[PDB]
Design an enzyme around this catalytic site. Structure first.
Site, PDB file in Angstrom:
ATOM      1  N   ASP A   1      -6.355  -6.381   9.770  1.00  0.00           N
ATOM      2  CA  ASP A   1      -7.614  -5.638   9.866  1.00  0.00           C
ATOM      3  C   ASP A   1      -8.811  -6.442   9.381  1.00  0.00           C
ATOM      4  O   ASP A   1      -9.931  -6.245   9.860  1.00  0.00           O
ATOM      5  CB  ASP A   1      -7.542  -4.295   9.111  1.00  0.00           C
TER       6      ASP A   1
ATOM      7  N   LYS B   1       0.802  -1.214   0.000  1.00  0.00           N
ATOM      8  CA  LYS B   1       0.000   0.000   0.000  1.00  0.00           C
ATOM      9  C   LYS B   1       0.841   1.273   0.000  1.00  0.00           C
ATOM     10  O   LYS B   1       0.387   2.324   0.459  1.00  0.00           O
ATOM     11  CB  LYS B   1      -0.946   0.002   1.206  1.00  0.00           C
TER      12      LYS B   1
HETATM   13  O1  LIG Z   1      -5.887  -2.899   4.641  1.00  0.00           O
HETATM   14  C1  LIG Z   1      -6.329  -3.985   3.770  1.00  0.00           C
HETATM   15  C2  LIG Z   1      -5.262  -4.924   3.297  1.00  0.00           C
HETATM   16  O2  LIG Z   1      -4.260  -4.170   2.544  1.00  0.00           O
HETATM   17  C3  LIG Z   1      -3.191  -4.991   1.987  1.00  0.00           C
HETATM   18  O3  LIG Z   1      -3.724  -5.890   1.092  1.00  0.00           O
HETATM   19  C4  LIG Z   1      -2.455  -5.685   3.195  1.00  0.00           C
HETATM   20  O4  LIG Z   1      -1.411  -6.484   2.666  1.00  0.00           O
HETATM   21  C5  LIG Z   1      -3.465  -6.548   3.967  1.00  0.00           C
HETATM   22  O5  LIG Z   1      -2.812  -7.188   5.045  1.00  0.00           O
HETATM   23  C6  LIG Z   1      -4.545  -5.640   4.499  1.00  0.00           C
HETATM   24  O6  LIG Z   1      -5.560  -6.367   5.183  1.00  0.00           O
END
Ligand SMILES: OC[C@H]1O[C@H](O)[C@H](O)[C@@H](O)[C@@H]1O
Ligand SMILES: Cc1csc(NC(=O)c2cc(Sc3nncn3C)ccc2N)n1
Ligand code: NA
EC number: 2.7.1.1
Length: 448
Positions: free
Chosen positions: A192, A156
């Protein structure tokens, strides 16, 4: 008239979705099995969060939420609820990570986080209280246990030297000691997706799937322990973090990827990784839009072949713009204001074309995403007996929650793909904080 055929590239037929879905299922099975877990694009990471929890401790818990740049510290209160624990956020504060410590080492990063925790404990005269801490941490982690696991890599757009490969819970406990004031008992760390599932579980015991569609995209689900080969024991059930955002990283998605997708990836902080996520997530949606717009101005189909300085600068088309464009009542006012703010002077048809481009991207996102969820739900169908599997999905994320029609398209598409399933969707209140706290309260029955 090159316009609609350029946007038509985003369409996905039914048989396309089914194909993506079946592949997703293939990669999920691959991630769960010992012989392929190491090489699998869809890592299917054991979270060590297990079924039949009770009992649980009750009382105040401190909850950390990182994932990240604007991370939250809050105080959750857990108690003996009706058929589980109730919980509630009683205090909270956001902190912005300085782009400096953000760039600096990991110990720099977790130092700044330790500070913010003290900042919070002061403001609320808790500095001397020593609470259990639930850590929501939204990045891929290979867990050794519920309170131990290493960062596989940042996602991200996040990045910070010297964090990957290290025990994340370890780094935080360190930084806390490099402070002196408080003593925090770090009990649980969860993705999350997981926290959200847990929050919703006490609202609806059928909820066995957690899904996030915000900046990034990912899901988690309750797996049968015998299928989790990387944890020993065939008895019971354990939540698994799919990390499906990385689906496509072994080329599972090649036949669907567009030029705009390749541009987005190549110029990303993590080229080659999280390709599926880059089709859906809000970190990328606006940028896909921007690239489509630029391709239109180049075919002289849009803005009279004249792009503005801003529209040419990467990242200028914020995902929230996509969402405002699609909220336009049809007086083009909303669309005009955004475009104007970007240094453009759109004609009436310019605005309508731009709205079209937004719908094409966000619609593709909604469908791509529905394929993965359907893949998960249909995998789980394999392990249920009743004729109709009734199941609840907990969901969070700005894209899913705030984008005017994403969720409707998504729901309909998931349903098309999941026959003999009754799916209920729940949005999570403070799923991150209360989710982490709820899990801590149960983990405290053995470490507190
Ligand atoms: O925030 C949403 C998602 O973003 C990305 O895909 C992260 O790698 C994952 O762990 C997280 O849950
Ligand atoms: C080892 C360990 C530490 S914490 C833990 N369990 C939890 O925190 C927990 C897990 C679930 S998963 C579940 N069970 N039935 C249905 N669903 C979705 C639900 C509520 C919870 N509080 N296990
Ligand atoms: Na097992």
């Amino acid at each position: 008239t090159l316009v609609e055929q350029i946007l038509a590239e985003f369409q996905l037929q039914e048989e396309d979705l089914k194909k993506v879905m079946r592949r997703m299922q293939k990669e999920m099975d691959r991630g769960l099995r010992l012989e392929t877990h190491e090489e699998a694009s869809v890592k299917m990471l054991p979270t060590y969060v297990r079924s039949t929890p009770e009992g649980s401790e009750v009382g105040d818990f401190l909850s950390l939420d990182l994932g990240g740049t604007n991370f939250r510290v809050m105080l959750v209160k857990v108690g003996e609820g009706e058929e589980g624990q109730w919980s509630v956020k009683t205090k909270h504060q956001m902190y912005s990570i300085p782009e400096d410590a953000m760039t600096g080492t990991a110990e720099m990063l977790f130092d700044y986080i330790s500070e913010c925790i003290s900042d919070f404990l002061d403001k609320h005269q808790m500095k001397h209280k020593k609470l259990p801490l639930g850590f929501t941490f939204s990045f891929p982690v290979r867990h050794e246990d519920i309170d131990k696991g290493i960062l596989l890599n940042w996602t991200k757009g996040f990045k910070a030297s010297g964090a990957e490969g290290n025990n994340v819970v370890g780094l935080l406990r360190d930084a806390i000691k490099r402070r002196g004031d408080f003593e925090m008992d770090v009990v649980a760390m969860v993705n999350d997706t997981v926290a959200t599932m847990i929050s919703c579980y006490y609202e609806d015991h059928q909820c066995e799937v957690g899904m996030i569609v915000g900046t990034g995209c990912n899901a988690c689900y309750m797996e049968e322990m015998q299928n989790v080969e990387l944890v020993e024991g065939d008895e019971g059930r354990m939540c698994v973090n799919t990390e499906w955002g990385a689906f496509g990283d072994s080329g599972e998605l090649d036949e669907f990827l567009l030029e705009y997708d390749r541009l987005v990836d190549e110029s990303s902080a993590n080229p080659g990784q999280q390709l599926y996520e880059k089709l859906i997530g809000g970190k990328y949606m606006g940028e896909l839009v921007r690239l489509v717009l630029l391709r239109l101005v180049d075919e002289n189909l849009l803005f009279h072949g004249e792009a503005s300085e801003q529209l040419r600068t990467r990242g200028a088309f914020e995902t929230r713009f996509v969402s405002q464009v699609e909220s336009d009542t049809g007086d083009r006012k909303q669309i005009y204001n955004i475009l104007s703010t970007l240094g453009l002077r759109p004609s009436t048809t310019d605005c309508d074309i731009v709205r079209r481009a937004c719908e094409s991207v966000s619609t593709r996102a909604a469908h791509m995403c529905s394929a993965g969820l359907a893949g998960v739900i249909n995998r789980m169908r394999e392990s249920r007996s009743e004729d109709v599997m009734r199941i609840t999905v907990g969901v969070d994320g700005s894209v899913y929650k705030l984008h005017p029609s994403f969720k409707e398209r998504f729901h309909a598409s998931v349903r098309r793909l999941t026959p003999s399933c009754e799916i209920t969707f729940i949005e999570s209140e403070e799923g991150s904080g209360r989710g982490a706290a709820l899990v801590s309260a149960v983990a405290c029955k053995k470490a507190c």
